[PDB]
Write an enzyme that holds these catalytic residues in place. Structure first.
Site, mmCIF file in Angstrom:
data_model
loop_
_atom_site.group_PDB
_atom_site.id
_atom_site.type_symbol
_atom_site.label_atom_id
_atom_site.label_comp_id
_atom_site.label_asym_id
_atom_site.label_seq_id
_atom_site.Cartn_x
_atom_site.Cartn_y
_atom_site.Cartn_z
ATOM 1 N N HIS A 61 -18.782 -6.739 42.356
ATOM 2 C CA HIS A 61 -20.156 -6.312 42.120
ATOM 3 C C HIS A 61 -20.351 -4.812 42.243
ATOM 4 O O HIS A 61 -21.394 -4.316 41.812
ATOM 5 C CB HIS A 61 -21.151 -7.040 43.038
ATOM 6 C CG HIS A 61 -20.848 -6.944 44.500
ATOM 7 N ND1 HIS A 61 -20.071 -7.871 45.161
ATOM 8 C CD2 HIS A 61 -21.269 -6.067 45.442
ATOM 9 C CE1 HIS A 61 -19.997 -7.549 46.439
ATOM 10 N NE2 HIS A 61 -20.721 -6.461 46.637
ATOM 11 N N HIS A 91 -20.448 2.782 48.678
ATOM 12 C CA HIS A 91 -20.331 2.165 47.358
ATOM 13 C C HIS A 91 -21.474 2.697 46.519
ATOM 14 O O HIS A 91 -22.337 3.426 47.011
ATOM 15 C CB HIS A 91 -20.405 0.633 47.393
ATOM 16 C CG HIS A 91 -21.697 0.133 47.962
ATOM 17 N ND1 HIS A 91 -21.921 -0.007 49.316
ATOM 18 C CD2 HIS A 91 -22.890 -0.074 47.359
ATOM 19 C CE1 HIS A 91 -23.173 -0.380 49.512
ATOM 20 N NE2 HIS A 91 -23.789 -0.421 48.334
ATOM 21 N N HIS A 93 -24.326 2.039 43.015
ATOM 22 C CA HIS A 93 -25.024 1.220 42.030
ATOM 23 C C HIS A 93 -25.297 2.123 40.835
ATOM 24 O O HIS A 93 -25.687 3.278 41.026
ATOM 25 C CB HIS A 93 -26.367 0.745 42.602
ATOM 26 C CG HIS A 93 -26.243 -0.075 43.857
ATOM 27 N ND1 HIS A 93 -26.029 -1.439 43.846
ATOM 28 C CD2 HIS A 93 -26.140 0.310 45.152
ATOM 29 C CE1 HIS A 93 -25.889 -1.868 45.095
ATOM 30 N NE2 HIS A 93 -25.908 -0.818 45.899
ATOM 31 N N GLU A 103 -31.392 1.995 42.747
ATOM 32 C CA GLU A 103 -32.151 0.874 43.289
ATOM 33 C C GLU A 103 -33.506 1.350 43.795
ATOM 34 O O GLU A 103 -34.541 0.838 43.368
ATOM 35 C CB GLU A 103 -31.372 0.181 44.406
ATOM 36 C CG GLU A 103 -30.067 -0.384 43.862
ATOM 37 C CD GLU A 103 -29.455 -1.433 44.750
ATOM 38 O OE1 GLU A 103 -29.168 -1.219 45.951
ATOM 39 O OE2 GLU A 103 -29.269 -2.532 44.197
ATOM 40 N N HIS A 116 -24.640 4.571 48.452
ATOM 41 C CA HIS A 116 -25.001 3.984 49.744
ATOM 42 C C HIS A 116 -23.859 4.173 50.724
ATOM 43 O O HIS A 116 -22.746 3.660 50.495
ATOM 44 C CB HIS A 116 -25.301 2.495 49.604
ATOM 45 C CG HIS A 116 -26.554 2.222 48.844
ATOM 46 N ND1 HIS A 116 -26.844 0.997 48.271
ATOM 47 C CD2 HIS A 116 -27.620 3.021 48.604
ATOM 48 C CE1 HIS A 116 -28.030 1.067 47.692
ATOM 49 N NE2 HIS A 116 -28.520 2.283 47.878
ATOM 50 N N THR A 195 -29.348 -4.905 49.872
ATOM 51 C CA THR A 195 -29.839 -5.140 48.513
ATOM 52 C C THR A 195 -28.963 -6.110 47.736
ATOM 53 O O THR A 195 -29.223 -6.342 46.545
ATOM 54 C CB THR A 195 -29.965 -3.846 47.709
ATOM 55 O OG1 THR A 195 -28.671 -3.275 47.508
ATOM 56 C CG2 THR A 195 -30.879 -2.822 48.446
HETATM 57 C C1 LIG Z 1 -24.048 -4.082 48.637
HETATM 58 O O1 LIG Z 1 -23.391 -4.923 49.539
HETATM 59 C C2 LIG Z 1 -23.389 -4.808 50.930
HETATM 60 C C3 LIG Z 1 -22.758 -5.833 51.592
HETATM 61 C C4 LIG Z 1 -22.693 -5.685 52.992
HETATM 62 C C5 LIG Z 1 -22.070 -6.667 53.764
HETATM 63 C C6 LIG Z 1 -22.005 -6.546 55.184
HETATM 64 C C7 LIG Z 1 -22.626 -5.363 55.809
HETATM 65 C C8 LIG Z 1 -23.256 -4.377 54.918
HETATM 66 C C9 LIG Z 1 -23.236 -4.571 53.574
HETATM 67 C C10 LIG Z 1 -23.880 -3.580 52.893
HETATM 68 C C11 LIG Z 1 -23.931 -3.782 51.581
HETATM 69 O O2 LIG Z 1 -24.548 -2.768 50.918
HETATM 70 S S1 LIG Z 1 -26.108 -2.458 50.508
HETATM 71 N N1 LIG Z 1 -26.434 -2.498 48.896
HETATM 72 O O3 LIG Z 1 -27.352 -3.271 50.949
HETATM 73 O O4 LIG Z 1 -26.239 -1.046 51.265
HETATM 74 C C12 LIG Z 1 -21.316 -7.692 55.895
HETATM 75 C C13 LIG Z 1 -21.513 -7.625 57.423
HETATM 76 C C14 LIG Z 1 -20.650 -8.996 57.721
HETATM 77 C C15 LIG Z 1 -20.378 -9.634 56.328
HETATM 78 O O5 LIG Z 1 -19.238 -10.414 56.290
HETATM 79 S S2 LIG Z 1 -19.364 -12.013 56.074
HETATM 80 N N2 LIG Z 1 -18.364 -12.770 57.222
HETATM 81 O O6 LIG Z 1 -20.899 -12.518 56.096
HETATM 82 O O7 LIG Z 1 -18.616 -12.301 54.659
HETATM 83 C C16 LIG Z 1 -20.228 -8.501 55.391
HETATM 84 C C17 LIG Z 1 -18.890 -7.802 55.675
HETATM 85 C C18 LIG Z 1 -20.537 -8.834 53.898
HETATM 86 C C19 LIG Z 1 -21.459 -7.906 53.056
HETATM 87 ZN ZN LIG Z 2 -25.768 -0.677 47.942
#
Ligand SMILES: COc1cc2c3c(ccc2cc1OS(N)(=O)=O)[C@@H]1CC[C@H](OS(N)(=O)=O)[C@@]1(C)C=C3
Ligand SMILES: [Zn+2]
Length: 257
Positions: A61, A91, A93, A103, A116, A195
């Site tokens: 993604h 990462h 967008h 976003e 971000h 997001t």
């Molecule tokens: C944009 O995507 C973001 C995903 C984030 C995540 C996590 C933390 C921050 C993310 C931030 C993301 O970016 S965003 N767009 O909202 O700033 C996770 C915390 C624990 C979780 O692992 S689990 N066992 O539920 O598969 C993590 C590592 C999965 C996604």
């Molecule tokens: Zn993001």
């Protein structure tokens, strides 16, 4: 599985993640005439001189650069934050055209992309615990406009050929994220969410006022990544942004007048 397509995109996410319709979802439109200047807010403290990047990864993604977060090496403090937050990853967008891709929006203006930088509150010990807390994450958001090239981004652009499809990764050491910051650290802040799924409402957003400029050749290379895995029908990774969500009971604060 969720994505950004017609049948699995943001308007569908609430079926698997009902918090998509919650009270502190992100992103939002920042209305600059309704944001309130708060003199109590402090300057951001960005300490990235000791950052250790590890890997770059196409996760299907977006693409992300991951950092060693086992010690206080690259930290974010100050601003609206209490305590110390460690850099985990960054990462982006971006859009299919230069007029969309961010976003957050500013007075309904969309930018070509949004960076971000994701940080987690060390009080909670590990990022999995932090996602369950209302103050667990702090995400620094930086807008990209198309214009002059950003030299500090070129190292990222040049490795993207090697992570073209979902699940590819490569070693990506000695990358200095200070090369991605604008000159000013003036910011807006509000309480929000991730997001992407799981859309958890655990984020203090810090959105910088000043964009960085990237060249058309740099953003073109983002648009050549693939959502699909290798050996699958090619679908270009573009428009991986969530549209703005209702502000509801929230106030956006500005660190500047
Ligand atoms: C944009 O995507 C973001 C995903 C984030 C995540 C996590 C933390 C921050 C993310 C931030 C993301 O970016 S965003 N767009 O909202 O700033 C996770 C915390 C624990 C979780 O692992 S689990 N066992 O539920 O598969 C993590 C590592 C999965 C996604
Ligand atoms: Zn993001």
């Amino acid at each position: 599985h969720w994505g950004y397509g017609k049948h699995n995109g943001p308007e569908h996410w609430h079926k698997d993640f009902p918090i998509a319709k919650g009270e502190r979802q992100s992103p939002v439109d920042i209305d600059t005439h309704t944001a309130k200047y708060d003199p109590s807010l402090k300057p951001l403290s960005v300490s990235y001189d000791q950052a250790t990047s590890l890997r770059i990864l196409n996760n299907g993604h977006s693409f992300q650069v991951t950092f060693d977060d086992s010690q206080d090496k690259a930290v974010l403090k100050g601003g609206p934050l209490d305590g110390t937050y460690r850099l985990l990853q960054f990462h982006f967008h971006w859009g299919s055209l230069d007029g969309q891709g961010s976003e957050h929006t500013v007075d309904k203006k969309k930018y070509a992309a949004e960076l971000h930088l994701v940080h987690w509150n060390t009080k909670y010990g590990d990022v999995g615990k932090a996602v369950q807390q209302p103050d667990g994450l702090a995400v620094l958001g930086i807008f990209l406009k198309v214009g002059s090239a950003k030299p500090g981004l070129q190292k990222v652009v040049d490795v993207l050929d090697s992570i073209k499809t979902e699940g590819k990764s490569a070693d990506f050491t000695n990358f200095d994220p200070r090369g991605l910051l604008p000159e000013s650290l003036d910011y807006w802040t509000y309480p929000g969410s991730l997001t992407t799924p799981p859309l958890a409402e655990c984020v203090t957003w810090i959105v910088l006022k000043e964009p960085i400029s990237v060249s058309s050749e740099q953003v073109l290379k983002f648009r050549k990544l693939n959502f699909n895995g290798e050996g699958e029908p090619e679908e270009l990774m573009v428009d991986n942004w969530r549209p703005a969500q209702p502000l509801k009971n929230r106030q956006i604060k500005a660190s500047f007048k």
